[PDB]
Design a protein around this nucleic acid. Structure first.
Lengths: 92, 92
DNA sequence: TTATTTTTTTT
DNA sequence: TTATTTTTTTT
């Protein structure tokens, strides 16, 4: 039901992949551990999903789909790209 | 056409009401000057009109029309009442 | 051929 | 009679 537990449980799973040991030796090699962690995905609500994406990624997406060109996207994304930097205020 | 000139012209009119002199004496008494300035009004766009209103005034309005009671108003007005304090960022 | 930067307000 | 504080996501 709760986001706080979805994220907590996901982190515990990654931790378990890190530190699970059998006969006293760590169960997975590093390439293996990166493999399993690759398979897990987490799906927040849309707004938080956006705010997770770094500016480089989203700019890359805008370029790749040439959506960098049209005005409404650029104005909107500029405003959002800004507020991040002062999201420390809960009101922001 | 331009807001910068509407506000500039209004301020010049108030200044003229202040300092217009006839035969070397100031044309209007203080109660007169407050009278004329009472008659002038200025009508910005809606958003700036809101941001001019002090929190006390808008809270008084919300109370007088009991709109203080309903949730959407309070959430929205709280958010706006906040951002003002950090409107120094143009992005905000 | 001609050859840019622009304002305002509301939904 | 019974007697509150609550989460999440999208439009």
């Amino acid at each position: 039901d709760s986001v706080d537990n979805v994220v907590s449980a996901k982190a515990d799973l990654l931790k378990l992949i890190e530190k699970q040991t059998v006969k006293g030796e760590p169960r997975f090699t590093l390439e293996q551990q990166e493999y399993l962690k690759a398979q897990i995905v987490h799906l927040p609500n849309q707004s938080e999903q956006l705010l997770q994406c770094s500016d480089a990624v989203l700019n890359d997406v805008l370029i790749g789909f040439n959506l960098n060109a049209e005005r409404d996207v650029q104005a909107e994304w500029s405003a959002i790209s800004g507020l991040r930097r002062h999201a420390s205020n809960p009101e922001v």
